[PDB]
Amino acid sequence: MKSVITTVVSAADAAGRFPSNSDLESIQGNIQRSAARLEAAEKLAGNHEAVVKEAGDACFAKYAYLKNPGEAGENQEKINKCYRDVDHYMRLVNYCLVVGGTGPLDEWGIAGAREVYRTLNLPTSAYVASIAYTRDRLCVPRDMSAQAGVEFSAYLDYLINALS
Amino acid sequence: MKSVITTVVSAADAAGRFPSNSDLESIQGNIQRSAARLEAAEKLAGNHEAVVKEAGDACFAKYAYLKNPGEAGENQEKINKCYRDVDHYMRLVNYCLVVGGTGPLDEWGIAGAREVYRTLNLPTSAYVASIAYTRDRLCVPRDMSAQAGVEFSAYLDYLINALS
Amino acid sequence: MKSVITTVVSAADAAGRFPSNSDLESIQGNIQRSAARLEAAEKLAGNHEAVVKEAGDACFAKYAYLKNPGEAGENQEKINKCYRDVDHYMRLVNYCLVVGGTGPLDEWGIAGAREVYRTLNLPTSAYVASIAYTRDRLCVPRDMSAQAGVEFSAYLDYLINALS
Amino acid sequence: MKSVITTVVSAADAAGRFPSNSDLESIQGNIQRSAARLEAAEKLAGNHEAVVKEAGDACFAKYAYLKNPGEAGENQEKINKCYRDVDHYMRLVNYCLVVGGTGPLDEWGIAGAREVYRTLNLPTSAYVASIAYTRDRLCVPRDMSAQAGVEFSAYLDYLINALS
Amino acid sequence: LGFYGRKADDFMARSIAMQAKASAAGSGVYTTQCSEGASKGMAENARTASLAKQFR
Amino acid sequence: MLDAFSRVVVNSDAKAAYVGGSDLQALKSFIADGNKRLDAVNSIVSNASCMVSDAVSGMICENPGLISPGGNCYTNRRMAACLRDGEIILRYVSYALLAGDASVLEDRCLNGLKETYIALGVPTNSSIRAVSIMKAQAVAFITNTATERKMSFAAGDCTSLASEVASYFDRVGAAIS
Amino acid sequence: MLDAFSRVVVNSDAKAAYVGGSDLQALKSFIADGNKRLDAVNSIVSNASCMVSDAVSGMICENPGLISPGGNCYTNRRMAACLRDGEIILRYVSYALLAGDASVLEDRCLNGLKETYIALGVPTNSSIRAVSIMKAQAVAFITNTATERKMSFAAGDCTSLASEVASYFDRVGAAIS
Amino acid sequence: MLDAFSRVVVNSDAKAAYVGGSDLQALKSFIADGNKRLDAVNSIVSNASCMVSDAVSGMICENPGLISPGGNCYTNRRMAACLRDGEIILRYVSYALLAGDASVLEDRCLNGLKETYIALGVPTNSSIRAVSIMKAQAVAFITNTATERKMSFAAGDCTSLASEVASYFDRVGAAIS
Amino acid sequence: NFRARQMSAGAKAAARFNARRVANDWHNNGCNYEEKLTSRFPAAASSVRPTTNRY
Ligand SMILES: *C(=C)C1=C(C)[C@@H](Cc2[nH]c(/C=C3N=C(/C=C4\NC(=O)[C@H](C)[C@H]4CC)C(C)=C\3CCC(=O)O)c(CCC(=O)O)c2C)NC1=O
Ligand SMILES: *C(=C)C1=C(C)[C@@H](Cc2[nH]c(/C=C3N=C(/C=C4\NC(=O)[C@H](C)[C@H]4CC)C(C)=C\3CCC(=O)O)c(CCC(=O)O)c2C)NC1=O
Ligand SMILES: *CCC1=C(C)C(=O)N[C@H]1Cc1[nH]c(/C=C2\N=C(C[C@H]3NC(=O)C(CC)=C3C)C(C)=C2CCC(=O)O)c(CCC(=O)O)c1C
Ligand SMILES: *[C@@H](C)[C@H]1/C(=C/C2=NC(=C\c3[nH]c(C[C@H]4NC(=O)C(C=C)=C4C)c(C)c3CCC(=O)O)/C(CCC(=O)O)=C2C)NC(=O)[C@@H]1C
Ligand SMILES: *[C@H](C)[C@H]1/C(=C/C2=NC(=C\c3[nH]c(C[C@H]4NC(=O)C(C=C)=C4C)c(C)c3CCC(=O)O)/C(CCC(=O)O)=C2C)NC(=O)[C@@H]1C
Ligand SMILES: *[C@H](C)[C@H]1/C(=C/C2=NC(=C\c3[nH]c(C[C@H]4NC(=O)C(C=C)=C4C)c(C)c3CCC(=O)O)/C(CCC(=O)O)=C2C)NC(=O)[C@@H]1C
Ligand SMILES: *[C@H](C)[C@H]1/C(=C/C2=NC(=C\c3[nH]c(C[C@H]4NC(=O)C(C=C)=C4C)c(C)c3CCC(=O)O)/C(CCC(=O)O)=C2C)NC(=O)[C@@H]1C
Ligand SMILES: *[C@H](C)[C@H]1/C(=C/C2=NC(=C\c3[nH]c(C[C@H]4NC(=O)C(C=C)=C4C)c(C)c3CCC(=O)O)/C(CCC(=O)O)=C2C)NC(=O)[C@@H]1C
Ligand SMILES: *[C@H](C)[C@H]1/C(=C\C2=NC(=C/c3[nH]c(C[C@H]4NC(=O)C(C=C)=C4C)c(C)c3CCC(=O)O)/C(CCC(=O)O)=C2C)NC(=O)[C@@H]1C
Ligand SMILES: *[C@H](C)[C@H]1/C(=C\C2=NC(=C/c3[nH]c(C[C@H]4NC(=O)C(C=C)=C4C)c(C)c3CCC(=O)O)/C(CCC(=O)O)=C2C)NC(=O)[C@@H]1C
Ligand SMILES: *[C@H](C)[C@H]1/C(=C\C2=NC(=C/c3[nH]c(C[C@H]4NC(=O)C(C=C)=C4C)c(C)c3CCC(=O)O)/C(CCC(=O)O)=C2C)NC(=O)[C@@H]1C
Ligand SMILES: C=CC1=C(C)[C@@H](Cc2[nH]c(/C=C3N=C(/C=C4\NC(=O)[C@H](C)[C@H]4CC)C(C)=C\3CCC(=O)O)c(CCC(=O)O)c2C)NC1=O
Ligand SMILES: C=CC1=C(C)[C@@H](Cc2[nH]c(/C=C3N=C(/C=C4\NC(=O)[C@H](C)[C@H]4CC)C(C)=C\3CCC(=O)O)c(CCC(=O)O)c2C)NC1=O
Ligand SMILES: C=CC1=C(C)[C@@H](Cc2[nH]c(/C=C3N=C(/C=C4\NC(=O)[C@H](C)[C@H]4CC)C(C)=C\3CCC(=O)O)c(CCC(=O)O)c2C)NC1=O
């Protein structure tokens, strides 16, 4: 996991040490901006079927070569698995708005992503660019609050950053 | 444990090596001065009830503040445990005249003494000074032999040294 | 080096510790039997040219095969080096009667003896048996004192033991 | 004398100038040097009984023709006369380590001495073996401090530049 | 980082190892986890193992 | 390691569930009770040097048979290791009071903890008495119901945190048994 | 870890007792016997490679089952691993006599020794046979009943050491069985 | 490492000198002064907590520049390393007093030790002051010229060890200079 | 290898708690799977040797 609980209660154990006031201070920043963090979570829970479909053929507009046989998108059975694949990325980013850090991303959906995809001849360049479509796809005083998009947008360009 | 057996049969195992004549030499010094070492042991076995009582209120003369409530000597139930505490130090120093080194002291009554006492609000300054009362409390040609006090007195100032 | 000084002042440094009376006791056994140890040293200093010649062709009686070409004793130039070789063993055993332990033997003339000799096609079986000739070659109330031969003879069968 | 301080005094008298800090510079440069220089300057008064029967006869080990008629050992009181010129030439080496310069010798030792020794016909090429034994027996980190025997060499073979 | 710094650097790490040889021998035992040999003596032969590691 | 915000996502991922507001209101009330949790965990670690003494001196004033030599627990390094083992478990449970979840406990100490104790000769019946006195003083310390020591607070209910520490210490006691 | 000096202080440790003037007259035999104990231990360590070469040859005298190929002990590294294991009983039974107690023998080899030998396929009957050769040659070396080796001694008894060394090779014979 | 029994052999091994009774009698004085040599070393290890509290308090009595903050030796961890460095130099001279030789001082302490202190920033002049107090009290401890503390002894001259310990402490001082 | 299982019963019992004291805290931070691999298998997580000394 990955949160501020994974920082300070682990470092006090790594020092063999009490939860001193360095550790008690670090979780106060959760409290004053969990209200900033957790109206973003029900947006992509409310749009968990809305923006998966608008990101797939926005990716498949700029990656339209896949439909030949012998590639990653040779039939609709691939595309039926492909909207599963962006949504499984989209599940975890919703959960990282809850745990604070990128907890469910790294130990489940990020580490060893660069041992899988082109071995299964899946293009990694379409994977970041489907996400980079949704990275700029926001409008901060109109969709959500202004205190909600800066947790959302910093996780989506991280998904291009973590594949780097 | 801690003796010359703990030096040379362990270092030959730490070298992966025979008991060569470096190891056979080191125990010869036990033999020529065990007679020097082991008429000191029956002195404090003969005085195992004599000098526990003379050290407690010699300590409690120079530490007479303990008898208030809220401290380490608030009742006689503490003092009934307190003559147990100096005697439990006094048991081990008798045994170190037998094993040669400070064998029963370090692994039983010395290591982690500085994690216990003032946590139980017991003063460590009275602990060394009760022992330092008994450190100079000797008379080498009169109580024991002259070859017996130099093993005894070197262990008692060690008890102040090991608490340092 | 290898003596009782190499035991107790090194183990007190290996414990990070004072020279306590375990260390002060171990050298007392030097003092009471250095007179036992050091009339043996001037025997083989007095016979440093006497028993080198009597050990070479006692070895070369039971190892008489060496005089052919292509072996370890093909000329007198080998035998001129061969009385150097037993004397260089004989120098060190004289010094181990002075330092107490086998100090000059192991770090100079013993360690890595089993990487040299048959690589230089020198027979190691003649090396221990030239020494084992001199091992029983003693007479304890007649040559030296009775307290002198038991340091001498225990070092010579050690030379067969250290080559094992 | 030519000392550490005395150079800039006459240099202040040369121009009419004053002591600056560059005139004050090397007084620090001796007190940063002489933390161990006075050890061997004490050990020239601390080993001067074994070395008078080392360096007094180290001439005689090489110059064995001193007992020729017409030399310094034909009579017994002139064997004393070369021995005091090792006894004064290790009490003046005791006096030369402390000045900084060659202070005893350029007023008393070198002062005319190339004229002196060949009309009394004493060989000044035999005076080098009183000094050459004080140049090879010098094992520095066991006899003195490790810096101190390097500079002790430098006063000592400057005398060899005077005699040869 | 200096000749003076280089000859300083092996002295305290010898003292760090001799600090840590004195926690192994906190109680005065050459404790059995440290082994540096075999049955036959051969720690002079394992000197040449460790001085190879000193050299390599 | 894993906390109360992370307990609610490891089950939803096992059913591939997007976490919505059906269960978020338990965590809004958890983040409501953040400073209440803070005003709990300050008072535990403040006097915790006194708490490990009050355990192991109260553990032995019911049983002097440990200090009776030839027993397991008489000598001072043994008592140092007793006060090692006494503080470390109190150190570990204070991470769980901060977490609101006991998953910081279960891997770092609870794995094989009892089987090492019978391999060491530790009597676990004295251990379950010792953890009870630690449980006894801590519920009086997260409240202001101690003997003499009274920290200053803002008032209100803290028994819901006291049911968490009551569900923490016995889970250690279920693992050292 | 513990000499025959110190067997009589760890049982007085269990009673909160001290070594008073009744238990140590066997110890005042044990310190008056300092140089008769010393005159036995030169006689063992002088001929240490005799005794490991007399035991394994006498073991291959009585048993040609191991010398057969596919047996336990027939080949080169294998018989070299015997002279590892052949001396290490003699290596610590020296210190059992040097300290006077087999407590220096009980933890340093006898822990886990039997179960490794079935894990290595070592037959324990040849192990208990070769240690009985090592007992029979050691009791003829501490005394004056060897074949040719005649060291200088002062007369008197040392059958008290002959019973001490007989209670040692049986203790290693019970622990490799 | 190396000592007075081994000092007389390394100049004789360098010349292949078969050692006979021309240099034995200087060691025979070391043989006869065995118990006199141990008489000084047990008065110096019996007050070693006094001397480490006497010297650097007497060093801070003469020069208060170190306890000024921003100086060298002022704060709490900083004073723990003062007793750390100050005690270990007393351990090494007590090794050196026993060997008849400061060789064991010369290799475990006296290699490179000087410019580690100025790669740290230790003033070397304050360490000459602390070692000179440790030179001056130790020569008052090996004789009976202490203030209050008089142990029981056998009388006579023992200046020959006072010249030995004074030739050891300046070897410490010239090494750190 | 024999002197691991020879020496004690409690120091080798303290080893299996010590094996998590190098791996959990400074070798596999963030991976819970690699964290419970230590607490289920300490002796397997003890020769993982991530101090890259090229051995
Ligand atoms: C082969 C069939 C066969 C042998 C090989 C040999 C082995 C053997 N030896 C003994 C008994 C002893 N061996 C001793 C050791 C030595 N004796 C010496 O003279 C030298 C100095 C030394 C070897 C370096 C000793 C002291 C004994 C005790 C009796 C004795 O003095 O001889 C046995 C018997 C073992 C037992 O009875 O348990 C064996 C098998 N003998 C063979 O038969
Ligand atoms: C500060 C103003 C100041 C001090 C602090 C104190 C330190 C000091 N002490 C000496 C000399 C000695 N100290 C000795 C040690 C002890 N004396 C005792 O009575 C007990 C047994 C023991 C301490 C546990 C001894 C023996 C001496 C020698 C003389 C004497 O007998 O007192 C000095 C002088 C050091 C020197 O001369 O180089 C100092 C600075 N004195 C202070 O002035
Ligand atoms: C973990 C225990 C330990 C401590 C403390 C320590 O200093 N070293 C280890 C184990 C150990 N090894 C030995 C003994 C010897 N080692 C050697 C080889 C040395 N020679 C070398 O060139 C090197 C590499 C730097 C080493 C280590 C030798 C020759 C011995 C002699 C013993 C013998 O069989 O005669 C020892 C014992 C002595 C010591 O204090 O080092 C230990 C504890
Ligand atoms: C957990 C998801 C981490 C993470 C793990 C990775 N580890 C990689 C290699 C690696 N990891 C370990 C420690 C761990 N792996 C094990 O198999 C065991 C024990 C059974 C442990 C404790 C080791 C020792 C190694 C090297 C070889 C190996 O795999 O065993 C790895 C591959 C890249 C790399 O070499 O580092 C990954 C991705 N990495 C993460 O991002 C999360 C936090
Ligand atoms: C469609 C818009 C994409 C595309 C998607 C495909 N992904 C395929 C397999 C696959 N994808 C992932 C990553 C994703 N799936 C997950 O289950 C999780 C985590 C919960 C993530 C992040 C994985 C790990 C796998 C392999 C296992 C699996 O099938 O789930 C896939 C099928 C490939 C095949 O079977 O040949 C497709 C079509 N591929 C594309 O190129 C566009 C960009
Ligand atoms: C009275 C003259 C003393 C004093 C003594 C007290 N010690 C108390 C507890 C205690 N003491 C030790 C050290 C000692 N006891 C041992 O069993 C052993 C080793 C065998 C030693 C060295 C320990 C480890 C403990 C804690 C466990 C125990 O009770 O044995 C004590 C009771 C304190 C309390 O219960 O509050 C007293 C009164 N205290 C003093 O201040 C003077 C100097
Ligand atoms: C003659 C009775 C011997 C025999 C002797 C030979 N040794 C030869 C070389 C040699 N020997 C040693 C060991 C010995 N020499 C030493 O210098 C020292 C230590 C100070 C010892 C213990 C060494 C290390 C060497 C190699 C270097 C050297 O030459 O000194 C030798 C010459 C062999 C050759 O050059 O081919 C001979 C003849 N050889 C025998 O077989 C009988 C038993
Ligand atoms: C100056 C340094 C001393 C001092 C030296 C003398 N000591 C004399 C006798 C002496 N000292 C001891 C105790 C000592 N020997 C040991 O073996 C041990 C511990 C390992 C210690 C502490 C003894 C037993 C003796 C008598 C034996 C002897 O040396 O003959 C002594 C007189 C010699 C004599 O009596 O024949 C001197 C000059 N004595 C002093 O007064 C200052 C403190
Ligand atoms: C801000 C982007 C610009 C302005 C207007 C627009 N509003 C748009 C709204 C829109 N957005 C989505 C996807 C949306 N739903 C989600 O859950 C998430 C991510 C978490 C996103 C981005 C959808 C389906 C709509 C249409 C229905 C609606 O209005 O809610 C938009 C995109 C184009 C569109 O489909 O309408 C623009 C443009 N106004 C401004 O001033 C900003 C420039
Ligand atoms: C030497 C200290 C001075 C002299 C005479 C004294 N003798 C004293 C004896 C004494 N000592 C004790 C305690 C004693 N018993 C022990 O088991 C141990 C330590 C292992 C000690 C120290 C007791 C109970 C007595 C009195 C009975 C007796 O004489 O045995 C002593 C202390 C005061 C006293 O109680 O008598 C002094 C003083 N003579 C000298 O020349 C020494 C200066
Ligand atoms: C004791 C062995 C038997 C008896 C008489 C013998 N004396 C012999 C003496 C002898 N030994 C040597 C070598 C000798 N010199 C040394 O330096 C060393 C070792 C350090 C030794 C062994 C020499 C050159 C002689 C002859 C001159 C002399 O007597 O000193 C001896 C050996 C044969 C011989 O050469 O004479 C025997 C036999 N008497 C007994 O009762 C013992 C059985
Ligand atoms: C205080 C100042 C002082 C010195 C600088 C040295 C140097 C020195 N040596 C001698 C004096 C002498 N030096 C020698 C020495 C020798 N003759 C030889 O042929 C050999 C080379 C060498 C053998 C050791 C002799 C023999 C005399 C006396 C001259 C004589 O009486 O024949 C003298 C003459 C005055 C005197 O008698 O002391 C001086 C100054 N010694 C000192 O006292
Ligand atoms: C015609 C039917 C119709 C609806 C029911 C809603 C649809 C709707 N909204 C919510 C979801 C929600 N609904 C509410 C609103 C409330 N929650 C309460 O308990 C209060 C009674 C009330 C306050 C006014 C909130 C706050 C959430 C998000 C929290 C959650 O339920 O998980 C849920 C349950 C979880 C989910 O699926 O998201 C549903 C079915 N829109 C519709 O068109
Ligand atoms: C002021 C300076 C100063 C010196 C130069 C020496 C000089 C000196 N060295 C030795 C005597 C000795 N010196 C050494 C030491 C050594 N032999 C070697 O092979 C190495 C080069 C060297 C350091 C390892 C030895 C081993 C002896 C005794 C045996 C011999 O003479 O070789 C002696 C005889 C008495 C004694 O042991 O002290 C003297 C006076 N001492 C001093 O005070």
Contacts of G48 (CB under 8 A, 6+ apart): C161, G87, G90
CATH no. for residue H101? 1.10.490.20
φ and ψ at residue C85, rounded to 5 degrees: -75, -35
Which partners does chain A have (≥3 C-beta pairs < 8 Å)? Answer: F, I
**Token reading at A80:** 């039926």
Contact B29 C32 (CB under 8 A): no
Q: Does F70 touch chain G (CB under 8 A)?
A: yes
Among candidates D39, D141, D147 on the partner chain, residue whose Cβ is nearest the Cβ of H170: D39
* Residue nearest to ligand 1 atom 28, measured at CA: G137
Q: Which residue has the tokens 């003369």?
A: B61
Q: Which residue has the tokens 């006599």?
A: G97
**Residue A139 among known ligand-binding residues:** no
CB atoms within 10 A of CB F92: 20
Residue of F3, F31, F23, I39 whose CA lies nearest to A104: F3
Contact E35 I6 (CB under 8 A): no
Which runs of E-coded beta strand occur in chain B? none
Please tell me the distance from the alpha carbon of residue G12 to that of residue G16, in angstroms, as a whole number.
6
Chain F interface, best mutation among B2, B86, B108, B114, by max F CB count within 10 A: B108
Atom of ligand 3 nearest to the CA of E48: 22
Please tell me the distance from the alpha carbon of residue H154 to that of residue F174, in angstroms, as a whole number.
67
How crowded is the C-beta side of H122, counted as CA atoms within 13 Å?
A: 21
Atom of ligand 11 nearest to the CA of C142: 1
- With contact defined as beta carbons under 8 Å apart, do G170 and G49 qualify? no
Chain F interface, best mutation among I5, I32, I33, by max F CB count within 10 A: I32
CB atoms within 10 A of CB D64: 10
Contacts of G74 (CB under 8 A, 6+ apart): G66, G67, G68
**Token reading at D159:** 């005398």
Pocket of ligand 7 (CB under 6 A): C 56, 59, 66, 72-73, 78, 81-82, 85-86, 88-89, 109, 116, 120, 122-123, 126-127, 130
**Token reading at D135:** 């140049």
Please tell me the distance from the alpha carbon of residue A113 to that of residue H155, in angstroms, as a whole number.
85
CATH topology of domain B1-164: Globin-like (1.10.490)
SS3 sequence of H44-93: HCCCHHHHHHHHHHHHHHHCCCCCCCCCCCCCHHHHHHHHHHHHHHHHHH
* Domain ranges across chain B: 1-164
Q: Which residue has the tokens 């009976």?
A: H144
Query: How is H96-112 classified by DSSP, letter by letter?
Result: HHHHTSSHHHHHHTSSS
Atom of ligand 1 nearest to the CA of G61: 2
- With contact defined as beta carbons under 8 Å apart, do G85 and G78 qualify? no
In angstroms, what CA-CA distances link H29 with C97, C105, H25, H37? Answer: 19, 27, 6, 11
Q: Supply the DSSP symbol for C72.
A: T
Residue of G83, F154, F24 whose CA lies nearest to A41: F24
D21: three-class secondary structure by DSSP: coil
Atom of ligand 12 nearest to the CA of D85: 41
Residue of G172, G167, G137, G142 whose CA lies nearest to G157: G142
Structure solved using which method?
cryo-EM
φ and ψ at residue I2, rounded to 5 degrees: -75, -35
- Residue-number span of the structural domain to which H111 is assigned: 1-177
**Token reading at D30:** 């001796």
Please tell me the distance from the alpha carbon of residue H113 to that of residue B59, in angstroms, as a whole number.
43
- With contact defined as beta carbons under 8 Å apart, do A59 and A126 qualify? yes
H176: three-class secondary structure by DSSP: helix
Q: Does E40 touch chain G (CB under 8 A)?
A: yes
**Token reading at D85:** 């010129």
Please tell me the distance from the alpha carbon of residue B104 to that of residue H79, in angstroms, as a whole number.
31
Residues comprising chain H, all counted:
177
Amino acid at A10: S
Residue of A31, A27, A32, A33 whose CA lies nearest to A9: A27
d(CA E49, nearest CA chain B) in Å: 13
Which partners does chain E have (≥3 C-beta pairs < 8 Å)? Answer: B, C, G, H, I
Among candidates H103, H124, H170 on the partner chain, residue whose Cβ is nearest the Cβ of D142: H103
The C-alpha R_g of chain C, in whole angstroms, comes to 18
- In chain I, the residue whose alpha carbon lies closest to the alpha carbon of A2 is I30
Please tell me the distance from the alpha carbon of residue B94 to that of residue B152, in angstroms, as a whole number.
9
- With contact defined as beta carbons under 8 Å apart, do B97 and B87 qualify? no
CA distance between the termini of chain B = 21
How crowded is the C-beta side of E16, counted as CA atoms within 13 Å?
A: 6
How crowded is the C-beta side of I10, counted as CA atoms within 13 Å?
A: 7
Contacts of G14 (CB under 8 A, 6+ apart): F69, F70
Number of domains in chain F: 1
D73: three-class secondary structure by DSSP: coil
φ and ψ at residue A119, rounded to 5 degrees: -70, -35
Residue of G153, B109, A137 whose CA lies nearest to F79: B109
**Alpha-carbon torsion, ordered C48, C51, C56, C61, to 10 deg:** 180
Residue of H83, H97, H89, H95 whose CA lies nearest to H175: H89
Q: Supply the DSSP symbol for A49.
A: T
How crowded is the C-beta side of G89, counted as CA atoms within 13 Å?
A: 29
- In chain C, the residue whose alpha carbon lies closest to the alpha carbon of B18 is C162
